[PDB]
Swiss-Prot record:
Keywords: Amidation, Amphibian defense peptide, Antibiotic, Antimicrobial, Cytolysis, Fungicide, Hemolysis, Secreted. Expressed by the skin glands. GO terms for cellular component: extracellular region. Disulfide bonds: none annotated. Has antibacterial activity against the Gram-positive bacteria S.aureus ATCC 25926 (MIC=8 uM), E.faecalis ATCC 29212 (MIC=16 uM), and B.subtilis ATCC 19659 (MIC=8 uM). Has a less potent antibacterial activity against the Gram-negative bacteria E.coli ATCC 25922 (MIC=32 uM), and P.aeruginosa ATCC 27853 (MIC=64 uM). Has antifungal activity against C.albicans ATCC 90028 (MIC=16.7 uM), C.krusei ATCC 6258 (MIC=16.7 uM), C.parapsilosis ATCC 22019 (MIC=67 uM), and C.neoformans ATCC 90012 (MIC=33.5 uM). Has hemolytic activity against human erythrocytes (HC50=18 uM). The modification Lysine amide is found at residue 18. The keyword Ribonucleoprotein does not apply. It is found in: Secreted. This is Hylin-a1. GO terms for biological process: defense response to bacterium; defense response to fungus; killing of cells of another organism. It comes from Boana albopunctata.
Length: 18
């Protein structure tokens, strides 16, 4: 759940900034 959504988004972020 949140412990899976929060981390996922945390990565998507890296996929945005790089």
């Amino acid at each position: 759940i949140f412990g899976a959504i929060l981390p996922l988004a945390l990565g998507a972020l890296k996929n945005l900034i790089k």
